[PDB]
Paper text:
In a search for putative DNA-binding domains, BurrH, a protein that recognizes a 19 bp DNA target, was identified. Here, its apo and DNA-bound crystal structures are reported, revealing a central region containing 19 repeats of a helix–loop–helix modular domain (BurrH domain; BuD), which identifies the DNA target by a single residue-to-nucleotide code, thus facilitating its redesign for gene targeting. We identified BurrH in Burkholderia rhizoxinica, a symbiotic bacterium found in the cytosol of Rhizopus microspores. Each BuD repeat is composed of 33 residues, only eight of which are strictly conserved between the repeats.
The DNA bearing A, A and T at positions 4, 12 and 13, respectively, displayed the highest affinity and was the only one that yielded crystals of the BurrH–DNA complex; consequently, we performed the rest of the characterization using this target sequence. The models were refined to 2.21 and 2.65 Å resolution, respectively. BurrH shrinks 23 Å along the longitudinal axis wrapping the DNA molecule, which displays an almost unperturbed B-form. The electrostatic potential of BurrH shows two electropositive stripes running along the protein which contact the phosphate backbones of the double helix. In contrast to the TALEs, which only interact with their coding strand, the presence of the second electropositive stripe on the surface of BurrH determines the interaction of the repeat array with both strands of its DNA target. The 4th, 12th and 13th repeats in BurrH show new associations (Thr–A and Arg–G) involving bases in the coding and noncoding strands, respectively. Thr193 and Thr457 in BurrH associate with A+4 and A+12 in the coding strand. The guanidinium group of Arg490 builds a network of interactions with A+14 in the coding strand and T+6 and G+5 in the noncoding strand. In the final repeat the side chain of Arg753 disrupts the A–T pair, generating a hydrogen bond to T−1 in the noncoding strand and a cation–π interaction between its guanidinium group and the ring of T+20 in the coding strand. Therefore, all BurrH arginines present at the 13th position of the BuD repeat interact with the noncoding-strand bases, suggesting that these amino acids may play an important role in DNA target recognition and could be employed to restrict the interaction of the protein with double-strand nucleic acids.
Author numbering: 15 to 767
DNA sequence: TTAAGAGAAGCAAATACGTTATA
DNA sequence: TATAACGTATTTGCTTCTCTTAA
């Protein structure tokens, strides 16, 4: 084996690694019979691998046949004391088997440090976790971390005393199910009293403690807690910082760095938002050390605080400091850069962009696509998976946008494999190809495709159908919703609900939480009393359960400020309704002062984004009066989805469009639609060209308000071509000035291109 | 050599909020 | 109008590396 002198040193730098490097290049051929070159080098990357490699050749073959996988074998031998843990499978892989333990089960105990004497700790307290309430499953999760024998021997010791102290058995498990959990428990048993007497909830104590190094986080609260409060930090905010891996390091780093960041501009809420992830301590230190080099490249400190405000943000800030020059010397705009690094693992997505970006444009993909596939958590995996799978997907008959669809969401790497693995089978069930692309086309897409295959048969008989199985999953509800439909549609079919009802409530992101939410709330709603249609209206949108709970919490106060039932439902019955309902109560005061009636607030709030639109009607209503717009006009412009954006647009492009010849009434008609901000934008930049081509002012206004930005961009691209082919201006305008005008125009060109 | 523990980075999935385009 | 279809934020939950301390 020709080891690159990099590969060598990575073996030699281990405690005993000199002895190992001899051993591998002595018994090459033996080892070659069980291990790949990768497997070897991975085993040899741990302290004393000489003895671990010898333990693969003694116990490995005699474990291929005891029911273990070679992938499992490596994960156990490759580790500190990995030779003891492998010895301790051929020692007791049976006394555990004789007690109903899987192979993945035994593998999961041995595949961390200390694995050997944890296996024999399970062997002894399978009977004391038994007559204790604890399941066999429990035992494994606790023991699936480094040295979980400490965790086991200690759960048995703290459970009695804090079983009777407001802690679930599945809180005890959350705490001990982490490397260094013995510490975690023993630190709780001595600190939850002092923490209750400081206003910290029981749930909070759980979260603070249920990470690696939970014990350090727990003292750090009793140490820096009070001192953090007298800086401007909530007990809510404090427990969010400490609720992560290295909370003790994030807290301490806030103190050390906060007042220095709080003078560089960084608001205390921004700072915490950065300190509130894993490695929050690292981000903080990195932000303060890369502000200027970044302040001098076009990065606003709100933009800087985004890149820092995720997992491994410290690594994001640096990979951008170094590679913004390169990617800007490529064709990437600052906002694209921030998308590809403003995610967890952004440093990786970035490097992956350079590493595959050119090779991808060659494959067919423009840069809007590459930013879409990289602008996700795990975008590095996403781009790499698109390469390796590209020829395959083409064979299976998938469009290029159909690739960027599946690849464009989180876990897109996974989604692509799933449509190769599953999918050829899914046709046999009777699903369409675009039906399949919908299933794979959202987050958790790989997961959904499996769920469909597992469940669709039992579902169709249960009184549902494939078309509204596609509906439930293409609409983001996913695997979770399909499992929840299955297990709940019976309780739901005794409480009075219909199938298109159950379909509607499932057919949204979060729809599994909603199905259960209705079940828990439907009575109290009916008690108040809203009808079933109301419950379904409120529930059947993204974030359903939030909306259902907010109504119940606020229906009183709203009815105390002039608003009717049918008002509350209309404000609740869109995405963000929970948000829309809190904003009504908070901005209803000054909106009555500024000339807006009750039914108007409902008009402004009774769409998705109602919280934005109400706030936006609080900002611009002064300076829209002094431009000439009536109150009634401000209500039309805001009273659509995206209302907030269309009021910013009427401000921003309003004047520049006046010169061009558009009257204020015109501006209103173009802005008073879903997408109005874009209709104005498009008229702004494409209006003058269309005027040079022979189109009326009135023509442009007719298209922009029927119509829309899309229909204008289409007249723009193909108008000339339709003319050359003998179409008239009057034709092209009548056809584009309606709903789906864009598509109508592009169906009119097509026989030409 | 083997354990124990602590911190950080990255990946995937689920859920929540918002904006646009389409009859 | 209601909804399809995106675009992103926020939240949970791992697995995997690296690193230190300790015996």
């Amino acid at each position: 084996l020709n080891l690159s002198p990099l590969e060598r040193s990575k073996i030699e730098k281990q405690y005993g690694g000199a002895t190992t490097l001899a051993f591998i290049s002595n018994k090459q051929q033996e080892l070659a019979q069980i291990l790949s070159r990768a497997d070897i080098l991975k085993i040899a990357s741990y302290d004393c691998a000489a003895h671990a490699l010898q333990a693969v050749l003694d116990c490995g073959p005699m474990l291929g046949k005891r029911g273990f996988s070679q992938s499992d074998i490596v994960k156990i031998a490759g580790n500190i004391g990995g030779a003891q843990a492998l010895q301790a499978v051929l020692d007791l892989e049976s006394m555990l088997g004789k007690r109903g333990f899987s192979r993945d089960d035994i593998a999961k105990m041995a595949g961390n440090i200390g694995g050997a004497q944890t296996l024999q700790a399970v062997l002894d307290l399978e009977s004391a976790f038994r007559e204790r309430g604890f399941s066999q499953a429990d035992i494994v999760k606790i023991a699936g971390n480094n040295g979980g024998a400490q965790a086991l021997y200690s759960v048995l010791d703290v459970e009695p005393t804090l079983g009777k102290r407001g802690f679930s058995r599945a809180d005890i498990v959350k705490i001990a199910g982490n490397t260094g959990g013995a510490q975690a428990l023993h630190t709780v048993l001595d600190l939850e009293p002092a923490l209750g007497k400081r206003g910290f909830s029981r749930i909070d104590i759980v979260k603070i403690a249920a990470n690696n190094g939970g014990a350090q986080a727990l003292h750090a609260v009793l140490d820096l807690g009070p001192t953090l409060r007298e800086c401007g930090f909530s007990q809510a905010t404090i427990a969010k910082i400490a609720g992560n891996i290295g909370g003790a390091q994030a807290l301490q780093m806030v103190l050390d760095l906060g007042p220095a960041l709080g003078k560089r501009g960084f608001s205390q809420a921004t700072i915490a938002k950065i300190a509130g992830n894993i490695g929050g301590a690292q981000a903080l230190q990195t932000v303060l050390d890369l502000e200027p080099a970044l302040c001098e490249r076009g990065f606003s400190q709100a933009t800087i605080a985004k890149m820092a405000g995720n997992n491994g943000g410290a690594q994001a800030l640096q990979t951008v400091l170094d590679l913004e020059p390169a990617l800007r010397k490529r064709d990437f705009r600052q906002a694209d850069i921030i998308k590809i690094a403003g995610n967890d693992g952004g440093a990786q997505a970035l490097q992956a962009v350079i590493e595959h970006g050119p090779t991808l444009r060659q494959h067919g993909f423009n840069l809007a696509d590459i930013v879409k596939m990289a602008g996700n958590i795990g975008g590095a995996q996403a781009l790499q998976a698109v390469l390796d799978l590209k020829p395959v997907l083409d064979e299976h008959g998938f469009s290029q946008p159909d690739i960027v669809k599946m690849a464009g969401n989180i876990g897109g790497a996974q989604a692509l494999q799933a449509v190769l693995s599953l999918g050829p089978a899914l046709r046999e069930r009777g699903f369409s190809q675009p039906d399949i692309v919908k299933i794979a086309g959202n987050t958790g897409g790989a997961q959904a495709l499996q769920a469909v295959l597992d469940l669709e048969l039992t579902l169709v008989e249960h009184g549902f159908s494939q078309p509204d199985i596609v509906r439930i999953t293409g609409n983001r509800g996913g695997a979770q919703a399909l499992q929840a439909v299955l297990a709940l549609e019976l309780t739901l079919r005794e409480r009075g609900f219909s199938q298109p009802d159950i379909v509607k409530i499932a057919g949204n992101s979060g729809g599994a939480q909603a199905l259960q939410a209705v079940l828990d709330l439907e009575l109290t709603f009916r008690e108040r009393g809203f009808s079933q249609a109301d419950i379904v209206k409120i529930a059947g949108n993204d974030g359903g359960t939030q909306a259902l709970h907010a109504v119940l919490d606020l229906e009183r106060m709203l009815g105390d400020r002039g608003f009717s039932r049918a008002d509350i439902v209309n404000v609740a019955g869109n995405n963000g309704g929970a948000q829309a309902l809190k904003a009504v109560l908070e901005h209803e005061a000054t909106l009555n002062e500024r000339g807006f009636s009750r039914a108007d607030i409902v008009k402004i709030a009774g769409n998705g984004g109602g919280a934005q639109a109400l706030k936006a009607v609080l900002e611009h209503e002064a300076t829209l009066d002094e431009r000439g717009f009536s109150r009634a006009d401000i209500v039309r412009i805001a009273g659509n989805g995206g209302g907030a954006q269309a009021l910013k647009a009427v401000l921003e492009h309003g004047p520049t469009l006046n010169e061009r010849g558009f009257n204020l009434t015109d501006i209103v008609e173009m802005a008073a639609n879903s997408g109005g901000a874009q209709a104005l934008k498009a008229v702004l930049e494409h209006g003058p060209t269309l005027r040079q081509r022979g189109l009326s002012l009135i023509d442009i206004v007719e298209i922009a308000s029927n119509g829309g930005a899309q229909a204008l961009k289409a007249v723009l691209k193909y108008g000339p071509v339709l003319m050359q082919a003998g179409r008239s201006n009057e034709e092209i305008v009548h056809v584009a000035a309606r709903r789906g005008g864009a598509g109508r125009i592009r169906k009119m060109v097509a026989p030409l291109l």
